[PDB]
Each structure stands twice: as structure tokens, then as C-alpha cells.
Design a protein around this nucleic acid. Sequence first.
RNA 1: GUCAACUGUGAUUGAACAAGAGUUAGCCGCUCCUAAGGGAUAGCUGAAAAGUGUUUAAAGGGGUCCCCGUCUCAAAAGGGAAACAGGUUGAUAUUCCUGUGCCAAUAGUAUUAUGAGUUAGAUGGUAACAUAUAUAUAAAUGAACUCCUUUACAUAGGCUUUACACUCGGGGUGCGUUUUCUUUGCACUUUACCUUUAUAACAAACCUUGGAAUCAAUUUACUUGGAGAAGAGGUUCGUUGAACUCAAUUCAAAAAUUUGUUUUGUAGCAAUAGUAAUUCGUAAUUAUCCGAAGUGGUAAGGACUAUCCUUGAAAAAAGGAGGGAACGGCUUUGUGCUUUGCUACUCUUAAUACUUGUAUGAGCGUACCAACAACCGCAUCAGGUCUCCAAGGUUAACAGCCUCUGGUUAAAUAGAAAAAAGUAGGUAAGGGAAGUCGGCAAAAUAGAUCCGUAACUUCGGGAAAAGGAUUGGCUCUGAGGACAUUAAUGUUAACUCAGAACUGAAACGGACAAGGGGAAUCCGACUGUUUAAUUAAAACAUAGCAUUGUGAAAAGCCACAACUGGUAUUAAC
Lengths: 106, 85, 43, 247, 72, 60
Amino acid sequence: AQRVHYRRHNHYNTKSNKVRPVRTPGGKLTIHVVKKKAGKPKCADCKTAIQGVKALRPADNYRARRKNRTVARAYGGSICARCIRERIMRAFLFEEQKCVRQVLKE
Amino acid sequence: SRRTKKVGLTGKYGTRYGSSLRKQIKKIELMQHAKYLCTFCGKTATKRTCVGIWKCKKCKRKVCGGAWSLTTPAAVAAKSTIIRL
Amino acid sequence: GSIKRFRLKQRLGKCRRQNRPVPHWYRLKNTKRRHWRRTKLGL
Amino acid sequence: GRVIRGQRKGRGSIFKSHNHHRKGAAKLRHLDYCEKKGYIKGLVKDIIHDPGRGAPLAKVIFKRTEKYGKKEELIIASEGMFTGQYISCGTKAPLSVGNILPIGKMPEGTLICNLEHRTGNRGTLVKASGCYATVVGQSEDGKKTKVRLPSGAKKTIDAKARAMVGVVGAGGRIDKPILKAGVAHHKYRVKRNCWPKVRGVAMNPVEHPHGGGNHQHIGHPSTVSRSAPAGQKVGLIAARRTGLLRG
Amino acid sequence: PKQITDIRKFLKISRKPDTTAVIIMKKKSKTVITKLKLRTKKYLYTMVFADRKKAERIENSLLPSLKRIYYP
Amino acid sequence: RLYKLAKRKGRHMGIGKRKGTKNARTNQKTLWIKRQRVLRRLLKRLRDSKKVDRHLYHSF
RNA sequence: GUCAACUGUGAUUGAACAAGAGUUAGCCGCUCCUAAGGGAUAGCUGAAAAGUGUUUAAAGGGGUCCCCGUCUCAAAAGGGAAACAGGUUGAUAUUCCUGUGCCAAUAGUAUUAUGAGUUAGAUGGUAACAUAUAUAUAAAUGAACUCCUUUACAUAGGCUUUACACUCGGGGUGCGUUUUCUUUGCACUUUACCUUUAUAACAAACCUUGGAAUCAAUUUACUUGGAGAAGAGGUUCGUUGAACUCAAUUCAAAAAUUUGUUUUGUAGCAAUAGUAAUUCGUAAUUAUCCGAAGUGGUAAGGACUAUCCUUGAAAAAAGGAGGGAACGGCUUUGUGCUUUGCUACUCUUAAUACUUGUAUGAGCGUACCAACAACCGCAUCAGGUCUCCAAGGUUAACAGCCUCUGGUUAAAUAGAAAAAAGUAGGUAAGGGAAGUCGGCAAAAUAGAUCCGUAACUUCGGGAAAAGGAUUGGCUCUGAGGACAUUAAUGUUAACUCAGAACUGAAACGGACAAGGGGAAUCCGACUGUUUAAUUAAAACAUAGCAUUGUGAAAAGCCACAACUGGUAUUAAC
């Protein structure tokens, strides 16, 4: 084998300073600083990562197109589809229930 | 279970700390690590996630409770009293 | 250390320029010098 | 001599409280016109742990009465509170657990928590885990109300002042004994600079007045007057009775 | 660098005004195969032409203004 | 390579040559994991080929 | 270049002396953001000096006059857009050079091309969800006012995937051993960013169908299920980063578009560059460059699981959703606003031309050391001094021993002689603590595997108790996988275990590492801590027990000259 080092300093493996060793076309085993992996954006009520939305870091999410970011269906990446449905049912039925109360009262 | 004679779940403590304290710890830990029945979905998966908070895994929901068990006798009595009045 | 400050770098370059020996012609019409190992700039 | 540790504590320094883990001040809803005349219902959206407080905080959403949109409060979580629980606050609010009501509108012998010493002071009393106050009487011509502090003490406050139905969460916390010195360290790490708590009698008399003596004598009364100087107030100040409590 | 499958699109890219040069090279047996890489400022576009008949046809088809680069 | 040829023949190994524990020589958890995966693999193949029923599969 | 002095010896040497040379950045850092913090404004005190810091304010932003707002510095390891490969110098290189890219802005007006919409806002999919491939995935109406999310986070234990590393076996190249034996040993057989890289693959998540107790599916681990599981068929994310029909071509079939077969191609980058070569001298050519697999050492990710009377920063910045303000062009009355008459227009990227200050890329760092002499120690001081990179054999092993790459043979000196004495080491008959303050010193024990293990005990321990046995080398036997032919037969692998012979000076944990034990008394329970350079304990901490005071802004407890603070993001658990 051989030894290697960072070309950007910061040789300790921090949160941001992670590294992938790589062999070159020159046959030289070198080190490359690997891009920072992340957790995932979350549904508002359930805190659940959403289908159809890519998990891109905010620089890549700025460069990414709008089709990659979000879903046409209802309230997009805000809340998940099953969760939306139940909330819609609750909102409708409670208005119905309210209307029944109004009819009852007079 | 079929390992220790009397220390049971406090056998991890066994070589350290006073025996009576280990008895006291045993009672509290038995309550502490129990999996409670969930009022908000009917399964016995309700676990403590931090001191006052007992979360159901299945319906993903946080009930506020006692330190070592789901409910104090005091709170139950108070709840009952309010319904009574 | 390895990275530097513009003011410090300039003063150090000055001190180096001052360090170099006297013109020999001046004696035809050298009291102070520093050596890096035994005398530091004291900054 | 050299300044005693309790006197040194008030110089501020490294004896300021460890607030990093702590999620904000735990004061209740402020009094307003809507609370005064009627009631507001809110929804408990999340329950969160604070380690400076003995019990959880509850994140409660109200909708802005003077404007538009959703506003978040931090309430102390009552035992039996849950995420998605509806909490009601105000004069005309119904009696139920965790509701926030003027003490005048409690029936006697009820159990309550988060009392305030004056209206709109936002729950200054009865805040510790598992704790509760009892309403012990209501004035005949109103205006005042008599309540019982968790010390067992009775006190009379105005009827208008609010409190929160039920008992504080995380009860029975003191029942478990402290396992070990590391557990005690973890407790003080989120509290205050206050530990290890070394004996005064062990030290030089110069640096703690219980100190000195070749075989670690006290050599003087351990019962001190409240009239004493601060550097003399090391012992048991205003001690009416000493020895083991009996009867 | 970008591979372009469609010969007609490759010709269209050649006809585009930004494009300036043709880097063309013949490859030996492992029979002669020819790799043509075409130089636009945005990218260097590559087509691999299998045989001589393809290679002559592309070289003739390409605009004479384009700079033709041969390694020999 | 001569030593490895001996290891292939099983002959390089010797009882008093060992200085590591039985577990350090060959890990018990790993051996267990091999057996479980092979047994579960075997059961699934028997189920897939339908030579046993779900009841027998689950019990085994 | 060099030798007056220095380089504790010599000295032609030099980190000494003399003359020069040399560090090149839109992309690497700093620089930017906020934090723990610090400094102020607003106040208020104090003779002032100072002490404080939204706290009795007529104060930075967004909007057709209205709605919001204490400021400011503070991280060269937190957050934080964006660059790699090869080459090159006497000395630097992510920065010079060649090649390839990537990023942010990028004003006005007029042209053009690119797709939309019109005769004022696209589409598919039951659905989860998907859809613009223009040179270029550009462009998929939307104001106030709102709501989320990324930024953005603990520890422990296993499981798993990839990559680099390591090994074996085959073909190809050159060198090496070559008395004898060796179809042998060694070396080389290279491949990056970038292309929302395209696909394949898989752990997850979700959906349509489906409808389950005789519980099933199922992990090393338990998990999941009528609050809908198994099953069947999808979809998504994340890993990954040319895997796999992936692309082209071919012929056959589908069919008015899709599959099978052939021929090609390291997917572009990419061989021209690298390596081993081969010839030919002014420096140039030629030939070469790839088929299988195994070990599980690094590192990262993943799905998980468990623990806390402890639940594990923030903002700048970016993103998504809600909402429904606003709305063709020409001609024309009346007052930028309104009604009539007419129908190539309204958007949208990129390029171009023309004008408007000169319409692209700020500033700083980049040598060398990092101690084996460059820093601190009064000095080329066996001292101290942070972080990362981590080869082979032996082995549990990053140990110890030896080896390859890379490095070195300088240490403030050499030589000759060899006694005392010294110091660092060895070794010793017979006895075996009779020694001394005390077995101090030294020696004995020691690794694994197999047996066996007491008093006593808070029942957990004691415990590796005690005390035994075995261990080399060879030739065999057994146990433990993976694939495909209908129960048998084939193809085919890694190493570890267990047993048996034989063999030898019974020697064998061979060097190498490596518990002395027991019987008791006493103190401290314990893990912890301490007198920096004569002190680690029986002292201190510690849990546990008990005590006092205090219900609150006119409380407790403490600070400050004063005003004012701290406990307090507090409240008798």
C-alpha cells in the first residue's frame, strides 16, 4: 500500500470533513473529500420522509429543478398522502356535524 | 430469568451497591421497562422514551405519565373526582 | 504560523531587509544585527 | 480569612445556571381580554423534555386573536396530558384536567397545579414534578380563594388568579434512589455548579469556620441566628428545634 | 464530455455556430474503429463510428470551417 | 506459500500453536449466524418447492 | 560562492558567513454566518474614573404614505458554492502548463432562434406517483399575509452493503536463482473528478389489489398485522456509480412500434495520459497494457436494537406548502383610469446587436521546520509540544520479534589497551529467609485447550480460587458451503474445529509474551480524587441516613460604593 493525506487540511474526520481514498489514472492512491450526507425532510404531522422528493443537500436543492423537489399531488412535500386524506375527512365531517348541530338547535 | 436465584433484572448491578438499594431498584426497574397498553390503539407496546413521556410506537403518540409507570394513583383519583363532580 | 497576517509579514520582511550587512563604501568616506536561532524578534 | 463557598457563589462567575439544555422559560399563557371574558380552546401539539424543570413542557397552539395564523406557547405538561389533547383556558372554560381557570371557579377539594400569586403572573407557583395544590375554601362574598401549597401550607389569593387543573407530570421521580456518583454528576451537569459538596468541618478554619481542630472538632454551636452575618451563617440558621424529628 | 448517440443531432451540433473543432482518431484491433469528439465551448461531444464507410461519410459531411485534429 | 500449502492440507494447524481463545480462533456468533442462515435458507427452499406446509415450516 | 569567528572533536561540512533567486487561486483556506462569549447605543447610577446593559426609546428592514425592528464584533477543527486529472521547476503547485469542467452574478433597449399559452395560468397515472432530453431537463401564472422543512447534531452493541487494502490461481512482458533441484522468485498488467451521470442491484419506505387463528410472514437480535398481515403487482428514497442489454449494428420474430440472435465497444472522460518494454542519438519511433476468485484489516453508509432522575446548540442561507391581489394587443370618447369597434398576439430560456462611467470574477495567506538541531526549556538540550496517513510474516493483536516501501548509519569525539573499582547485565554446588525495618531485590508463577474448584457471601460473587493434565513435526480420518440435472447423480470453495497413528534426547505457550499463591487480622464499602518537584493514604468525594430555613418581586440564600445583580429559562418531587 501507500500513505495519503487531505489536500484541504482538516485531517480529523468531522461532521463535514469526511474522505474517500481513490486510485488515479497515474496509479497514485490519493484521498478525495466526500460530499456531506444528510437526514431527510419530514411530513409536518408525522415527521415522516416523503415519497417522490429527493433528499439533496441545500446547495444541490438550490441547483435542482422543481420537479425533483416536490410532488403535484395535494400539499406537495408538506404532508404525506394518506395523512392528507384523513385530515380532509375530519375537516368535512366536522362541518357536516356542525350543520347537524345548527339544524338541531332551532 | 433462569440464571439468577433472587437478584433477577438487577443482576447487571449485582457486584455493586447495597442489597436493599438493589431491592428498591428492582421494583422501580420492573415498572420502568414494562410495555404498557395503549389507550390510542389497543396494543401493549407503550414505552417510556424520556422520564415523564410514554410513547406508543405503533400510533406514534406521546402520553405524559409518571416517572416509572404510566399513571400515579393520585392522578387517577383526581381524574375520577373531576368526572364525579 | 503557517498562515500569516499582512502586517506581520510586512514587518518581518522589513526586519530581514534591515538585518543585511553595511555597504563597504560607507567605511571609505555595522553595530547591530540579529541571528534567527539565538535572537527572536520578540513580537 | 478566605471567603466561604456560599458567599463566593453570589459573585456570579461560574456559578450561573446551566441553561443550555433548557428550552425557554416555562411561564403560562398571559391574561388577555379573550381569556377574561370567555375562553379559548387550544391543541397540545407536542410534549418535550426540559431537565432544569422536573417535568416536561407542552407545545400548545392557539390562533392569533388580534391577527392571523398559528401561535405556539410552552405550558408545563400535566400528568395524563397527551399529544392531540385539547386544552381550554379562560373564565367561561369547562372544568376538566389540564384546563387553565381562575381559582374562584374551582369547586372545593379539587386538585390543581401551576398557581400564580397574582393574576397574569403566568404560573409562578406549583411547578415541580408530581406536585399539586388543593383548593381548601372560597370566600363567602367572593374575591378571595383559599388554597393549599404542596408544602401543606394554606394561603389566600384573589379568586381571579389562574391555575391549571390536575397534577404535574413525571411524578414519583424522587422515589428511585441515586444509583451512583456519575448519575449525580449527570444531574449537576444540567443544573448548577454546586458539587462535589465537601464538608466544612474537614477544611481549614480560615476557609470555612466549621473547620480546624486536630481531630476535626466543631468546637462551637451549629445553630446560628438569622440575625448572624452572612459569613457566620454557615450553620443551621434560625433553628427552632434540632435533633431527629419526632411526633 | 458527453456521448451523442444520434448522428443527425451530432451533425446539427456541428452546424451550430459555437462549435469549432473536430478531434478524430482511428483505433486498432483488440479492424479499424474511429472515435470522433466534437468541440463546442459547453462540452466535448463524442460519437464512436464503427467502420471506415461511416468515418469517411462523417468527415466529408462535417463543415470545412471546423478545425480537424488528427493525432498522427 | 509452502506454509499456506500446509494450511490447505490442514497440517500447519496445531493445538499448542494456538494462543487465542476458542472464540478468538473462530467466532461462536459467526458460526451460529452461518447455521441460522443455512437452516432458514433450507426451510425457505423447502417451502418454495412446496414439500412442506406453512404449519410445518413455522414450527421447524 | 565560501571558511576571520562559530558549527562544545576534526571540518574541505553546515540550519555559520557572502551574493543572488523563489511562495502566482472566481472554485483551497481565511475572508461570510451565528454560538459560548466580548464591546457599546438606549437608560441609570457613581465627583469623575467606572459599574451595569431594553431596563421608564419620538431609533434597520418590507410594502401605494403604510407594515414590521436594540446594535455590534466573537469559531483558520461548528455552519458555510464552486475543481479535478496528467505534466513541469534549482526551489511552488488544487494555484504555473495542458486537458477537461464546475459556480455565482450576468443592466437597459432592440432583434433573433427555443418551447408554452391565445383566437386569464400545461399534462399523464385508480393510485403511490410520474411527465419539458430545447447545442442547454430551460420555461409546468401567482401579490399581501400565513405555515412548515432543510441548516441541525447523544451513547452503547451487534447485523449488513460498498470502496480501498490484502491474498491466491491463469495468460502476457522483462529481470533474478539456476553445480544440483525448481514449468521458479520478483517486478508491471493502470483509470480520477465530471456527464441532476443513464441504467442494473439491494436494505428500507409507501401504494393498488388481496383478506389472514390451526397464527402467519420473520431477524443474529424482536418485530409486524382487521387502526389490514401474508400473498400478487407496482411506486419512491437512499446507497451505489458502466453493474446490467448499456448503446450501436445484424439477421429472425413482435408490428404500423417490441423481443430474440450476430457483429462491434475499456459508456463518454480514455489513452494521446500512466507502467514495464523495444529500437533508432538531433531528440524521435515502434510494440505492450487482462481473465477468474478469495481474506475481512481500514472507513463510510444503512436498516435496527438498547440505555439516561442526562434526551444530546444556534443563526445566516436555502427549499416546500397555504392563500387568492393582479392581468390580452390595436383604434377611440370622457377622467396613468373607463365604455365602444377590430384580431397575428401574451409568456419563456439562451444567443446577438446597440446604448448607458471603463458592464466578470475583491482582498489576504501559500518558503521551510513542525523537531531525528529550526518552536518552549538562557544552548544544534536523551526534556516538553496538538492532529491525520498506517504495508508483510508470526499472533487474539495497531502487542513483542523479524521483513518490504520510504528513511538512516548523525547523535559534543576517536583510537589503543585491559586490572582495580564503578554501572547496566548474566551465571552459579549443597542448603533454603537461618537475611533485614519489611522476602526489599531477584527468582518462581505465567498462553491456550481439557478437567476440577473451598471457606465464606449483601447470593451477585468468591474464581483464572485452590489444584491438576495436555501442547512439536509428519501421514491419515471425521464435522462444518455454494451452484444444476428427478430421491439419487453431477459441477465446485474458504478456512477452522475434533479424533487417530507414526516420528524425536517426553522437547514442544521451546524464542515471544506472560496471575506467585494460601490462612488471617485492620481500616476505608465501592468506580472516583488529592499535597505540580521529598505525601495516593486509613485523608477527601460518593451514594445512603438525618437536619435547618424559605410560599416569593415587602420570600429565602448570596453579590455590588451606588443603581443593580445572582440563585432564576427557578418554585417545596
